[PDB]
Ligand binder design. Structure first.
Ligand SMILES: Nc1ncnc2c1ncn2[C@@H]1O[C@H](COP(=O)(O)OP(=O)(O)OP(=O)(O)O)[C@@H](O)[C@H]1O
Ligand SMILES: [Mn+2]
Length: 335
């Protein structure tokens, strides 16, 4: 994930309350900047929310009063914030503050060169087992790009049609089969079945192991586990359950399209395998800007009386996929 990249200043607009600052559009994001830091069309380094930036008075003095400890080192975590009434996200700095990047090009990922890293909520301790092996290379990891970083693609996909589903807030979990072996994995490892492992227990109680055996194909069930003991259980659940959102065809190396997934989950439940699916909302004919898509992010969740974290969109061909995280949710939750 490109936590710090080189980007272009979009349109700049005043903020009436405090004229020492102004509102700057970096592609889909809005920043508060110092007035006269950028004119539109200038390049700079933009750090995304969740960046953790080590303490530097020369380079990041504007971060000096939100310094925290994190996993041993001292630095600043970027979150959604409301600065003098203006909702602002990330940090945009001009290039004359980065001499060692003087001849980098727009679009470059300078995460590693600046030592940026990602602040992460601590381990949910009921969800970490013993590791049989790494995540299998013949399976794609579950990762969604943010719509604020895709404005060119949204204009390209004008006219395309997308499946819209609720984005649950839980940890990712993969159950798969390759020919005589059925494995359970979290985000980055394949785990051994214990009387401990939350993922194995989710897999066994909805029987997706015999289900995958039954279906007799090299498929990867990918879902979020959510519920008790998981990210504050904002969905008011009893227990923990598996909610699917993608199926990776291992042999063809590509995800199932929505209707294929939809009919395969149907096939699974028909034969008595209790695989739940992330909530599907009605499909979308993309004719939108990033702002309008974000504007759909707020709304009812799996529990219809709680505000969802956001939405994810899947182009029906199955090859284009992005999320749009609710900013109201991000503001009503700082961790
Ligand atoms: N409806 C959904 N469709 C796809 N993924 C979903 C859905 N609901 C929840 N998820 C979760 O979304 C996550 C994948 O998105 P993402 O790549 O943003 O996660 P991340 O790598 O943990 O976060 P980030 O990279 O943005 O810091 C997975 O952890 C998966 O469990
Ligand atoms: Mn990711």
């Amino acid at each position: 994930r490109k936590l710090a990249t080189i980007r272009t200043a979009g349109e700049i607009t005043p903020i009436a309350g405090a004229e020492a600052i102004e509102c700057c559009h970096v592609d889909g994001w809005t920043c508060v900047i110092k007035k006269g830091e950028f004119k539109q069309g200038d390049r700079g380094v933009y750090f995304e929310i969740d960046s953790f930036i080590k303490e530097d008075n020369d380079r990041y003095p504007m971060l000096s009063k939100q310094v925290i400890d994190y996993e041993g080192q001292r630095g600043t975590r970027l979150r959604t914030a409301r600065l003098r009434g203006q909702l602002s996200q990330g940090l945009f700095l001009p290039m004359d503050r980065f001499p060692e990047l003087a001849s980098n090009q727009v679009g470059d990922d300078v995460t590693e060169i600046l030592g940026i890293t990602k602040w992460e909520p601590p381990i949910s301790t009921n969800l970490s087992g013993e590791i049989l092996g790494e995540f299998p290379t013949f399976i794609s990891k579950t990762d969604q790009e943010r719509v604020q970083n895709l404005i060119p693609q949204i204009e390209e996909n004008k006219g395309q049609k997308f499946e819209v589903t609720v984005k649950l807030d839980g940890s990712s979990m993969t159950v798969y089969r390759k020919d005589d072996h059925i494995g359970v994995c979290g985000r980055n490892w394949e785990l051994r079945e214990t009387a401990t492992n939350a993922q194995w227990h989710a897999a066994r109680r909805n029987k997706m192991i015999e289900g995958l055996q039954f279906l007799n194909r090299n498929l990867a069930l990918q879902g979020a586990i959510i519920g008790e003991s998981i990210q504050g259980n904002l969905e008011k659940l009893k227990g923990q359950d598996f909610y699917l959102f993608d199926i990776y065809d291992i042999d063809k190396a590509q995800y199932l399209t929505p209707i294929e997934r939809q009919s395969l989950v149907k096939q699974l439940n028909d034969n008595g395998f209790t695989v739940k699916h992330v909530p599907i909302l009605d499909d979308l004919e993309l004719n939108h800007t990033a702002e309008q898509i974000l504007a759909m992010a707020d709304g009812p969740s799996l529990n219809k009386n709680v505000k969802r974290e956001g939405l994810v969109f899947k182009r029906l061909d199955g090859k284009f996929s992005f999320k749009a995280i609710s900013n109201a949710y991000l503001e009503k939750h700082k961790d």
